[PDB]
Design a binder for this molecule. Structure first.
Ligand SMILES: Cc1ncc(COP(=O)(O)O)c(CNCC(=O)O)c1O
Ligand SMILES: Cc1ncc(COP(=O)(O)O)c(CNCC(=O)O)c1O
Ligand SMILES: [K+]
Ligand SMILES: [K+]
Lengths: 385, 385
């Protein structure tokens, strides 16, 4: 039984875009507003304010650490999912000829970093087909058939943003560690959709690097995200974008080394009030139930929506089995085109999004989504054909 | 005649830390709060919201451009001063043996980037003495005596954060362009203190790269800054940290090239509401008078404080002539030590800061600062000896 009242934005609209950005809870806006007030009353720049900011940062780092069941030292605070990927990709000691493998469902922004890396260090990159494994096949086996002697890193999204498939991460990791080549194969995971929807425990689930954001499923404000790096991989990642937050200081205030753990990849002044907003959102989700309970609630909503769409004659879900998470992608048989359809729905205050590849429409159901909203969506979709 | 009422934080304290972070004006907090409301009512992720966000970004880019009298295409929006420096430094095509020259008054965070760059590309770096040129000498001449055949870039703070000196940027640029070596010498300027206090016109003042932030003298919120790159230098800067905001898109949503002008160095999701806050703070300053008028007002206040300190027997200003800007640094003859003195002042709600090198105390006077605040500071300082 979710407390929908904590998310005022739900009230006069039918929202299904949590994957793009979550509806901000009241407690998050209160924390943001309270931080501006604290800074105005006590600083904004002063011993008291600077200490309050450092304490707030430690508190967020700790809440994130607890969310994934890991030590705070493995957590880096960023502004979004992408930055975490930039940190890992630019930090690796690349040699000409090294190879990177990405799935064919990765984000355009991520592909751009890889192209930038290829141009700078002379590495190469290839894609491997996973989109087609939504209803059959094995993504891990596809990867195994693409691994080569020069493969050094694999990049994949845990929950695919376009089709809604949850990749078999554990099996994929095993395939990578089993491989014998010039390098021990490592895996960088884009968790833009998975973090905050799927139950994640990095002490049970072995991962190398995991990038995420707080503004989508975690329902925090735009501008705050994070990155997990396993303690055994920290040494392989050289800091790149650095600043006063990245170092330790000497007698005369001179740089003497890298800050502890993930702090070495943090740069400088950030939007502190927003950090308090994310912290408040994180604590709110825990009061609603465990990650597991919230996950099952999300799946109950997506399946209900999925079933409803299966009944509509001119709508075709991409998944032939129940969604493994909160994402439900589908096409609509109509002369209008998916972008015009999404715009018409928004005109009715029903919010979904268009996907470029494959060309389809995507809806996100969260644990706070209810049956009336789903039925209202189904009702309006019934109009096209 | 400044409208102090627009800056509510001034009221029950005596603030002199504008160089660390400016007091946020009411119109800025209103704009931030209003943006959260707009996102909640119209999205937060949707056609309407996404368009509103893009329009806000263009509006801020344009206001910044007008502030420095340049074309919007030369402006990149970042989170702070440091990021701008990381973009320029990591973007240059460094070759082993290349040399970087920095003043001995640069920020620790900036030095850390340079050290990271030296380790990665095998370049070298050396400092040149400018601190000692506050009351005598010529910083441009010092630089001329250090320039070598392999010198490729010079890094300097336009307004020194530790001593308050305004470097002779025009003369320094001439010296650099006059030099004949293996590379045409370029200059990266750290404008953490100068932007928003000194009148800056990059159409009259020729500069290569100029990094700045909006949270200090411009009085915007923590988290939003920017970077200027001359059109003739854009090509030499390769994008490094990139994301979906850095590229142009193709038919199937794939990367087809770099976004226009400075957009190529912008990454991904940011704290949009804060952008509206900086935009509002920028427009507020323009309503108070021109940059020149505000600069003279700042100097009238700093000289008044400087004169006041010269009268105190146990206080010694670092500058033997009137401050060239709003920064007034000084030492205090006392067994207590400068950090204990700053803490005691804060106990009395008087806000200044300690400087590590040279070991001194620094006060910042803005155009909104008044005589009562300065006299109150002088009164409490009189207590030490
Ligand atoms: C799989 C995946 N990876 C990266 C992003 C970009 O996130 P940002 O926080 O802006 O760095 C996304 C964004 N998805 C929004 C959506 O799917 O609607 C993503 O899905
Ligand atoms: C000269 C100089 N350079 C960089 C910074 C860092 O700015 P950030 O926006 O956090 O990247 C500063 C900060 N100064 C604060 C102060 O002077 O009190 C600086 O001075
Ligand atoms: K159907
Ligand atoms: K004196």
């Amino acid at each position: 039984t979710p407390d929908r009242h904590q998310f005022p934005g739900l009230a006069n609209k039918t929202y299904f875009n949590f994957g793009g950005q979550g509806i901000l809870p009241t407690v998050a806006l209160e924390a943001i507003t309270a931080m501006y007030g604290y800074l105005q009353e006590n600083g904004p720049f002063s011993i008291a304010a600077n200490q309050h900011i450092q304490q707030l940062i430690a508190q967020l780092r700790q809440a994130l650490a607890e969310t994934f069941n890991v030590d705070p030292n493995t957590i880096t605070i960023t502004d979004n999912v992408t930055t975490g990927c930039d940190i890992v990709l630019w930090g690796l000691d690349w040699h000409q000829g090294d190879e990177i493998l990405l799935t064919d469902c990765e984000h355009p922004g991520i592909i751009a970093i890889v192209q930038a890396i290829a141009a700078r260090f002379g590495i190469t990159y290839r894609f491997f087909p996973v989109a087609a494994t939504l209803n059959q096949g094995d993504a891990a086996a596809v990867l195994a058939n693409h691994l080569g002697p020069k493969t050094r890193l694999v990049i994949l999204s845990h929950l695919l943003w376009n089709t809604g498939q949850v990749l078999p991460l554990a099996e994929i990791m095993a395939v990578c560690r089993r491989h014998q080549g010039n390098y021990p194969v490592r895996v960088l995971v884009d968790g833009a959709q998975s973090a905050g929807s799927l139950p994640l425990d990095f002490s049970r689930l072995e991962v190398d690097y995991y990038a995420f954001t707080g503004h989508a499923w975690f329902a925090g404000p735009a501008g705050v995200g994070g990155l997990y790096i396993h303690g055994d991989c920290l040494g392989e990642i050289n800091p790149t974008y650095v600043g006063w937050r990245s170092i330790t200081y000497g007698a005369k205030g001179e740089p003497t080394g890298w800050a502890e753990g993930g702090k070495r990849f943090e740069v400088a002044t950030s939007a502190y009030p927003q950090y308090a907003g994310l912290l408040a959102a994180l604590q709110l989700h825990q009061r609603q139930g465990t990650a597991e309970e919230r996950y099952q609630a999300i799946c109950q909503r997506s399946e209900f929506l999925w079933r409803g769409l299966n009944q509509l004659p001119h709508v075709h879900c991409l998944a032939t089995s129940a969604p493994q998470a909160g994402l439900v992608s589908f096409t609509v048989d109509s002369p209008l085109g998916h972008r015009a359809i999404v715009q018409k729905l928004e005109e009715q205050r029903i919010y979904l999004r268009t996907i470029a590849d494959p060309d389809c429409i995507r809806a996100c159901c969260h644990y706070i989504t209810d049956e009336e909203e789903i039925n209202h969506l189904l009702a309006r979709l019934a109009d096209f054909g």
